[PDB]
From a paper:
p27KIP1 (cyclin-dependent kinase inhibitor 1B, p27) is a member of the CIP/KIP family of CDK (cyclin dependent kinase) regulators that inhibit cell cycle CDKs. p27 phosphorylation by CDK1/2, signals its recruitment to the SCFSKP2 (S-phase kinase associated protein 1 (SKP1)-cullin-SKP2) E3 ubiquitin ligase complex for proteasomal degradation. In contrast, low p27 levels are commonly identified in cancer and associated with poor prognosis. p27 is degraded via the ubiquitin proteasome system, where phosphorylation at Thr187 by CDK1/2 signals its recruitment to the S-phase kinase associated protein 1 (SKP1)-cullin-SKP2 E3 ubiquitin ligase complex SCFSKP2. Notably, p27 bound to a CDK-cyclin module is the SCFSKP2 substrate and unusually the binding site for phosphorylated p27 is contributed by both SKP2 and the accessory protein, CKS126,35–38. Using cryo-EM, we provide an in-depth structural analysis of the quaternary architecture of the CDK2-cyclin A-CKS1-SKP1-SKP2-p27 complex which forms part of the SCFSKP2 E3 ligase that controls p27 ubiquitin-mediated degradation.
Numbering used by the authors:
A (entry chain F): 3005 to 3073
B (entry chain G): 4181 to 4190
C (entry chain C): 25 to 93
D (entry chain A): 16 to 25, 29 to 87, 89 to 296
E (entry chain B): 175 to 431
F (entry chain E): 2095 to 2419
G (entry chain D): 1002 to 1031, 1041 to 1064, 1079 to 1162
């Protein structure tokens, strides 16, 4: 169900984002942003090094990850 | 456990 | 706020009211029906001074069949 | 279902919109379209000739059209000829300037229903979300505008549409005709936002004075850079492809808001036809 | 100041003429009088207050009522239906979310039916020729956007209050064009607050001078002077709120030239 | 009401009801009133979340008695090269902010009465970690996502502050086995909760043994993503007589069946074992122990200020009054 | 039971039976510089408040207190002073809220004109106070 976005190679950083199937999107923290132990808990399965860096208010259901290059 | 740290090519 | 939930005037008979509204609702086709030679009530084209063709949706653009929201 | 299309008596077609809900009455879209398409009459606009109000259904006759820049948008493998794109935007920008000087907004300008005739004339046909700006109009969430055609002011959650929402959506996005591929094909609002920064620079407080207060303005934004002019290779250096407003100028009050798109070295060619298919 | 503004003003000054109600219905339909019309208007005012309907929609609904009534006789007791229908049609043109018909028949003390409201909405649209974009007073107030001073506030509230007051009193305001009463309301609030006169820019923007607005200006002054004295009022109950900066509290100068 | 003799208490009372922007404009006198405004009784709970901070703007506000400074997700990178005085802030929150290291040092080198810090996802430096050892009253330190400090700075920080109740030293990359060993062999014996998670190839059984022997009063222990726990470390947790919310999530070497062994512990209440319990066996494991809440409470409440499903704006049970709305 | 305390050489007419307990100064008592015309108002308000008797942020005022709000600015200034002198809690809360509400929005210009603050004149420091408070834009 979940979708994994492609990498938007920036300077000194590499990004991506993931949209939830709305059965997990209600299980998302709105005050704090999660860590590699809590978004791996929801069901997101990516490589090692992806960190949540910002939560987009108009779309709470989309998770944004960045990673040093 | 089979190298889970892999983006799922679905 | 029941001060807005009021009945300004004395109640008026509804049968003549709805009969009169239906009179205009049916008389609103005096000129339009004959002008276009189109039976808008039954969605049928009259054999008058207007050409009509039932073309498939694929041919004409999608603005002419865009499903109302 | 089937649509009945008429021709020249000496050409129009029926848009049959049904009313079978009886919950709010006639749809809000219909009242907002019929009322504004009677006082809006330009040679570069589709004309609403007549309307018939049946008790159960509501009709509307429209000037018949075909070219939708399906046909003449993607069905050009070798490409839509450049003289066409020198004229298919001149008339449409004329219509946009007229309507903005006529107290009417068009908002979503999907090239999907941007109907054009064989002779070469360009007319706007989209007026569902067309709230007139005589008095200020607040923003809407459920009012659907296609992701690929939303301004950075609207993506960042501003409150007033004002003008220059319609100036760029089709008066500056003709890259779906000169490149045959959407300039910013986003997948969501954040992804589209980043796609804009990729090829359009980054919203600092120098390009866009006051960008910081933007409701969606988060300082974590990926810091990219301008892509010069490699985005549109076919057109020549016509004032830098009119870089004064090319794509998006991040200042909506400097996005050729005052002057029209006609007082430029561009737009001095002839109107070629396209009667094929 | 955008570059298209003057053309918008010119088009509005051409388009309110075709959309001006006539004075015939005040003495051609003996079933109703201007008093009922005003009571229905006040009804609409609270109603707009209840559902937070925009004042622009109130102006548009009043204009629809005036233009509809001047071309067909309406019986007593059915003016409730046309008032409700006009409010509903006005909301469905400017308000982002139109209230459902059930709430608008609820407001009528549940004395009508949904189908009756819909049938009246059909007829009202039919007679008016489907021309609902009506230039009104508030549209002309905002047409002169803060041309007194760049940071001139607390004066627009009083002018908007004057504009709303002009709606209830049919006479002698049906004769005046919306632009004239708009200018007079824009002038009287300035005279009350800062004591200045008609701003110079509007003199060459509209073409109206301080002598052309005098017949209307008197009428607006007279209406303001008795505004608390006038009974059957609810528009004054809205502008006494701190949102309107209490324009109703301030007394008229009563010394207007 | 205005006078040259109006009571200061009365006008302070009228001020107390004013909002933050109104208070900014409460300086009507442009003179005397100006002073009575910057009184410390007014600025006591500053909810300056988001927004932005100019040079020496957060410093000036912190100077006049602010104790709860909620400033998460903010942009305060502009250098503050101006003399200040020791701030009395006691409950800071700079979670996921974008502060620069230099100005972070400049500000944090003055707060000495702190007892609630949250520097999640921020880049620190040695001087900044050392200067956090000058305020020993810390009972809650959140440090997840941080980086940039050597082992000596961590040793000094964790040896000087001997009162920490809750530490969240999790997912701090640029960590070697030496960092984990120093963090476990020097953490205060008074801690009741810890979150040494995310260290796959640095956590060995010896470190767990040191932790369980040294610290006997743990109530929560989250060793998430620990690939070196095997099947012989359950007797290590059996030595914990107060553990209640052990979360051995994603420990691949752990055999599923022997999770039944963890049911013998009486104090155990919940057990998040996400990632290693296969389908079907999870239901049987839940049925076997009805007293355990297997596979619940996804997120961590360990030293996180704003925990809650509903949108909350109180940091560790403290609600601010002065807010930016 | 029915105590009518001394006034500023005026008329002693009050009950103070569970009524003056709201006034902390009266509580310590069981006058020096009172004023009688609001003092009767203080008595009636205190009676009604005792009838009402059976981070926090709220600003609402009961209908009785909006009706009894002294319209005259000098009357309100005297009422606030009497409330401070008598150490009334509830009525002090009401008058503080009323002064804040009148202060709400408006303008310092209008604020110093409706008040007796004629000391607005400063050594061009208004520019300083405009620059310092420029970190919050609306």
């Amino acid at each position: 169900q979940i979708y994994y976005s492609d990498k938007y190679d920036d300077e000194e950083f590499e990004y991506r984002h993931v949209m939830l199937p709305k059965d997990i999107a209600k299980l998302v923290p709105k005050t704090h942003l999660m860590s590699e132990s809590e978004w791996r808990n929801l069901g997101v399965q990516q490589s090692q090094g992806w960190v949540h860096y910002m939560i987009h208010e108009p779309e709470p259901h989309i998770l944004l990850f960045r990673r040093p290059l | 456990a089979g190298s889970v740290e892999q983006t799922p090519k679905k | 706020k029941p001060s807005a939930c009021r009945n300004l005037f004395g109640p008026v008979d509804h049968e003549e009211l709805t009969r009169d509204l239906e009179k205009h609702c049916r008389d609103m086709e005096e000129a339009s029906q004959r002008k276009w030679n189109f039976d808008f009530q039954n969605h049928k084209p009259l054999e008058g001074k207007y050409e009509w063709q039932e073309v498939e949706k694929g041919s004409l653009p999608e603005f002419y069949y865009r499903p109302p929201r | 279902g089937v649509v009945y299309k008429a021709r020249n008596k000496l050409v129009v077609a029926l848009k049959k919109i049904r009313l079978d809900t009886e919950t709010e009455g006639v749809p809000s879209t219909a009242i907002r379209e019929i009322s504004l398409l009677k006082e809006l009459n330009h040679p570069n606009i589709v004309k609403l000739l007549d309307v018939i109000h049946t008790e159960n259904k509501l009709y509307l006759v429209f000037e018949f059209l075909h070219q939708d820049l399906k046909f003449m948008d993607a069905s050009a493998l070798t490409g839509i000829p450049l003289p066409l794109i020198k004229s298919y935007l001149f008339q449409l920008l004329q219509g946009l300037a007229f309507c903005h000087s006529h107290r009417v907004l068009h908002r979503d300008l999907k090239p999907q229903n941007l109907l054009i005739n064989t002779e070469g004339a360009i007319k706007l046909a989209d007026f569902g979300l067309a709230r007139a700006f005589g008095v200020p109009v607040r923003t809407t969430t459920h009012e659907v505008v296609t992701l690929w055609y939303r301004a950075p002011e609207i993506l960042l959650g501003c409150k007033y549409y004002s003008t220059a929402v319609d100036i760029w959506s089709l008066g500056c996005i003709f890259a779906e005709m000169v490149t045959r591929r959407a300039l910013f094909p986003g997948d969501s609002e954040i992804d589209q936002l980043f796609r804009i920064f990729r090829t359009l620079g980054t919203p600092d407080e120098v390009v866009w004075p006051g960008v910081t207060s933007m409701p969606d303005y988060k300082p974590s934004f990926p810091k990219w850079a301008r892509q010069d002019f490699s985005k549109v290779v076919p057109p020549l250096d016509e004032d830098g492809r009119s870089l004064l407003s090319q794509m998006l100028h991040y200042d909506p009050n400097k996005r050729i808001s005052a002057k029209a798109a006609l007082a430029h070295p561009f737009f001095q060619d002839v109107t070629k036809p396209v009667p094929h298919l | 100041v955008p570059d298209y503004h003057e053309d918008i003003h010119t088009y509005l000054r051409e388009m309110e003429v075709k959309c001006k109600p006539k004075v015939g219905y005040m003495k051609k339909q003996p079933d109703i009088t201007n008093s009922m019309r005003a009571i229905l208007v006040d009804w609409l005012v609270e109603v707009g207050e209840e559902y937070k309907l925009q004042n622009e929609t109130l102006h548009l609904a009043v204009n629809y009522i005036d233009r509809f009534l001047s071309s067909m006789s309406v019986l007593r007791g059915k003016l409730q239906l046309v008032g409700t229908a006009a409010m509903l049609l006005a909301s469905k043109f400017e308000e982002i979310y139109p209230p459902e018909v059930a709430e608008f028949v609820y407001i009528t003390d549940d004395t009508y039916t949904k189908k009756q409201v819909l049938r009246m909405e059909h007829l009202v649209l039919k007679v008016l020729t489907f021309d609902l974009a009506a230039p009104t007073v508030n549209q002309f107030l905002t047409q002169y956007f803060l041309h007194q001073q760049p940071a001139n506030c607390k004066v627009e509230s009083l002018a908007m209050f004057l504009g709303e007051l002009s709606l209830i009193d049919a006479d002698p305001y049906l004769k005046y064009l919306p632009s004239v009463i708009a200018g007079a309301a824009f002038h009287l609030a300035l005279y009350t607050v800062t004591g200045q006169s008609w701003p110079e820019s509007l003199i060459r923007k509209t073409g109206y001078t301080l002598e052309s607005l005098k017949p209307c200006l008197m009428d607006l002054h007279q209406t303001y002077l008795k505004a608390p004295q006038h009974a059957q009022q609810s528009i004054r109950e809205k502008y006494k709120n701190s949102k309107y900066h209490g324009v109703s509290l301030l007394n008229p100068p009563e010394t207007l030239n | 009401v205005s006078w040259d003799s109006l009571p200061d208490e009365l006008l302070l009372g009228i001020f107390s009801c004013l909002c933050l922007p109104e208070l900014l404009k409460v300086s009507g006198v442009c003179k005397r009133w100006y002073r009575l405004a910057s009184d410390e009784s007014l600025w006591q709970t500053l909810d300056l979340t988001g927004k932005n901070l100019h040079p020496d703007v957060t410093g000036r506000l912190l100077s006049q008695g602010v104790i709860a400074f909620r400033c998460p997700r903010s942009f305060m990178d502009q250098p503050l090269a101006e003399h200040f005085s020791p701030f009395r802030v006691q409950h800071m929150d700079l979670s996921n902010s974008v502060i620069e290291v230099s100005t972070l040092h400049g500000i944090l080198s003055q707060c000495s009465k702190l007892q609630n810090l949250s520097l999640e996802g921020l880049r620190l430096s040695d001087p900044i970690v050392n200067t956090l050892a000058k305020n020993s009253n810390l009972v809650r330190l959140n440090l997840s996502g941080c980086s940039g400090f050597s082992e000596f700075a961590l040793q000094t920080l964790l040896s000087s502050c001997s009162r920490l109740d809750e530490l969240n030293l999790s997912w701090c990359f640029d960590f070697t086995e030496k960092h984990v060993q120093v963090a476990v062999a020097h953490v205060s014996e008074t801690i009741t909760q810890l979150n040494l998670s995310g260290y796959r190839k640095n956590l060995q059984k010896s470190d767990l043994s040191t932790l369980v022997r040294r610290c006997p009063n743990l109530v929560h222990l989250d060793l998430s993503d620990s690939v070196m726990l095997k099947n012989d470390c359950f007797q290590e947790f059996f030595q914990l007589n107060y553990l209640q919310h052990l979360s051995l999530s994603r420990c691949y070497d752990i055999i599923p069946e022997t999770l039944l062994e963890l049911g013998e512990i009486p104090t155990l209440k919940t057990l998040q074992v996400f990632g290693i319990v296969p389908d079907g066996t999870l239901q049987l494991l839940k049925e076997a122990l009805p007293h355990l809440q297997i596979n619940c409470s996804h997120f961590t409440t360990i030293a996180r200020p704003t925990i809650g499903n509903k949108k909350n704006q109180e940091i560790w049970g403290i609600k601010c009054r002065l807010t930016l709305q | 039971p029915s105590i009518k305390l001394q006034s500023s050489d005026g008329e002693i007419f009050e009950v103070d039976v569970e009524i003056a307990k709201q006034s902390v100064t009266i509580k310590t008592m069981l006058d020096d510089d009172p004023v009688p015309l609001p003092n009767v108002n203080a008595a009636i308000l205190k009676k009604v408040i005792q009838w009402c008797t059976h981070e926090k942020r709220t600003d609402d005022i009961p209908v009785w207190d909006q009706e009894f709000l002294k319209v005259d600015q000098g009357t309100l200034f005297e009422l606030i002073l009497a409330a401070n002198y008598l150490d009334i809690k509830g009525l002090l809360d009401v008058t503080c809220k009323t002064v804040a509400n009148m202060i709400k929005g408006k303008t310092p210009e209008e604020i110093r004109k409706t008040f007796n603050i004629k000391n607005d004149f400063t050594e061009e420091e208004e520019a300083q106070v405009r620059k310092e408070n420029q970190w919050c834009e609306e």
